[PDB]
Amino acid sequence: GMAEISADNEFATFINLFPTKPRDQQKLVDLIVKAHEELIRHRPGYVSGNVHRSVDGYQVVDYTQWRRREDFEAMVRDPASAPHFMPIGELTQGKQGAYDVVYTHVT
Amino acid sequence: MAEISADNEFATFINLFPTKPRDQQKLVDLIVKAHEELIRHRPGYVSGNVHRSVDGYQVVDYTQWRRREDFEAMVRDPASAPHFMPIGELTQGKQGAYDVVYTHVTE
Ligand SMILES: [Mg+2]
Numbered sequence: 001g002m003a004e005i006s007a008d009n010e011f012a013t014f015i016n017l018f019p020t021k022p023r024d025q026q027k028l029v030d031l032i033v034k035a036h037e038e039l040i041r042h043r044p045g046y047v048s049g050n051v052h053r054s055v056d057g058y059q060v061v062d063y064t065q066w067r068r069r070e071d072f073e074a075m076v077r078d079p080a081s082a083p084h085f086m087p088i089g090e091l092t093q094g095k096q097g098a099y100d101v102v103y104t105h106v107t
Numbered sequence: 108m109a110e111i112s113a114d115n116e117f118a119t120f121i122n123l124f125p126t127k128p129r130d131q132q133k134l135v136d137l138i139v140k141a142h143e144e145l146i147r148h149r150p151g152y153v154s155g156n157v158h159r160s161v162d163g164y165q166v167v168d169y170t171q172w173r174r175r176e177d178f179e180a181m182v183r184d185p186a187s188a189p190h191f192m193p194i195g196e197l198t199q200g201k202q203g204a205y206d207v208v209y210t211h212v213t214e
Contacts, residue, residue, distance in 0.1 A: 003212045005109040005156045005169065015158060015167050017123070033209045041211055050111045051209035052121060061121050061205065063111070063169070099158035099167065103139045105147055106109050106154040 003048035003065065007104040011047050012069040015061065015099050018092040022057030028091045029053050029060055035084040040064070045071025060092075069098050109154040109171060113210045117153045117171040120178055122202040124194070128163030134197045135159050135166055141190035146170070151177025166198070175204050 020028050029051060036049045047065035054060065066072045075081055076096075088094065126134050135157065142155045151173035158167040172178045181187055182202075194200070 001212070001214075002110040002112055003210055005111070005154075013158065015160075029208055036209060036211060041213075046213060048111075048212040049209070050207065050211075052119065052205040053208045054121075055204045055206060059203065059205075097165065098161045100161060101156065102135060102159045103142060103155065103157040104109060105142065105156075107147070107152060 003050050003063075005101060005104055007101045009101055011065040011067060012072065013099045013101060014064045014066065014069075014072050015097060016064070017095045018060040018062070018088070019095075020058060020060055020092050024091050025053065025057045025060060028088065031084075031088050031091070032060060032062055035088070039081060039084045040075065043071060043075045072098075109156055109169075111207055111210050113207050115207050117173065118175040118178065119205045119207060120168070120170045120172065120175075120202060121205050122168040122170065122200055124166040124168070124198040124200045126164060126166060126198050130197050131159065131163045131166065134194065137190075137194050137197070138166060138168060141187075141194065145187060145190045146181065149177065149181045151180075178204075 018028060032051050040049055045067035050063040052061040124134060138157050146155055153171035156169040
């Protein structure tokens with residue numbers, strides 16, 4: 001019932017790092033959660049979205065899973081995405097990237 | 108498997124290790140070795156999840172703990188230095204604790 005991290009790399013994984021400032025951080029979080037609620041979760045190939053707020057106030061991290069990297073990229077290229085992503089770029093210079101999960105262990 | 112929960116049952120660290128393509132696999136190898144030989148045996152350890160950016164410029168460790176204090180205790184322990192010193196030779200890690208504020212997954 002929850003997003004799961006596993007090194008089979010069945011999914012593509014993006015870790016988007018949005019550096020911020022403490023006074024902007026919650027506004028940035030709210031915008032990202034709105035995008036997920038209203039746009040991102042409905043994209044073809046979407047698997048999961050997981051928004052993390054740094055306790056020190058300087059960073060937001062969006063951990064998102066997709067069937068293929070192309071599904072995330074298609075979303076970013078879609079002009080329909082601009083109403084949701086434009087205010088985010090007003091607050092932060094997001095650093096987006098795909099990752100391989102090369103090691104996962106749980107107790 | 109490691110699960111992302113908006114209940115924040117566990118503490119979450121997202122440790123960011125900037126690097127460069129020629130160093131990245133050596134860094135990954137040293138981080139995974141530390142996980143298998145040291146981190147996973149620490150009190151309070153819940154999970155370790157090492158991610159290698161496809162572009163060669165970053166390694167991200169998503170690790171879960173009983174309490175933030177358990178991770179901090181490991182970092183402060185001089186017994187960790189043989190595993191962690193070679194990593195610091197490759198990268199200036201930016202580590203920090205996070206709150207999971209939003210999670211969603213397809214069914
Ligand atoms: Mg191995």
